[PDB]
């Protein structure tokens, strides 16, 4: 049962407190963002350019 | 109102021995003051453990997350 069935593409690095990469292989979406200001959790588009940057170097 | 030497980084100590099967999710934090830090939510005890990012299985895990 994949918690992420929907993804949001309109998310910027600046909006996020942290990312949670769910250990759920088989699920297409496993990236959940805990958002700043409101503490809502939303699954994000894994294609967001900033993700690879955040998952840092 | 000052805010200094009171708001610690999520991680100061790390663990390099963690089995992927005992990981529910990886909490990735990345801030200017603390850099990249990974906190694993463990399956066996639901506790949070800071892990070494240089771990081998981490890269593939993150990679397979389509990002």
Swiss-Prot record, chain B:
Task: Indicate the impact reported for residue 27 to A.
Answer: Impaired CXCR4 activation
Q: Where is this region: Receptor and heparin binding?
A: 8-12
Q: Where is this site: Important for dimer formation?
A: 25
Q: What is the effect of changing residue 47 to E?
A: Greatly impaired CXCR4 activation
Q: Changing residue 14 to A: reported impact?
A: No effect on anti-HIV-1 and chemotactic activities. Slightly impaired chemotactic activity and no effect on inhibition by heparin
Record annotation: effect of changing residue 47 to A: Impaired CXCR4 activation
> What happens when you mutate residue 8 to Q?
Greatly impaired chemotactic activity and enhanced inhibition by heparin
Changing residue 36 to C does what? Formation of an intermolecular disulfide bond, leading to a locked dimer. No effect on CXCR4 activation, but loss of chemotactic activity
**Effect annotated for changing residue 8 to K:** Slightly impaired binding and activation of CXCR4
- Name the residues that bind heparin: 20-30, 41, 48, 64
Upon changing residue 25 to L, the result is: No significant effect on dimerization in neutral pH. Eliminates the pH dependence of dimerization
- Identify the residue span(s) of motif Receptor activation motif: 1-2
**Region of interest called Receptor binding, as start-end residue ranges on this chain:** 18-20, 27-29, 39-49
Cysteines paired by S-S bonds: 9-34, 11-50
Q: What is the effect of changing residue 49 to A?
A: Impaired CXCR4 activation
Site, Important for integrin interaction and activation: residue positions: 24, 27, 43
Mind telling me what this protein is named? SDF-1-alpha(3-67)
Annotated organism of origin: Homo sapiens
> Which part of the entire protein is covered?
22 to 88 of 93
């Amino acid at each position: 049962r994949c918690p992420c069935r929907f993804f949001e593409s309109h998310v910027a690095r600046a909006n996020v407190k942290h990312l949670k990469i769910l250990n759920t292989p088989a699920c297409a979406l496993q990236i959940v963002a805990r958002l700043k200001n409101n503490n809502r959790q939303v699954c994000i588009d894994p294609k967001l350019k900033w993700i690879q940057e955040y998952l840092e170097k």
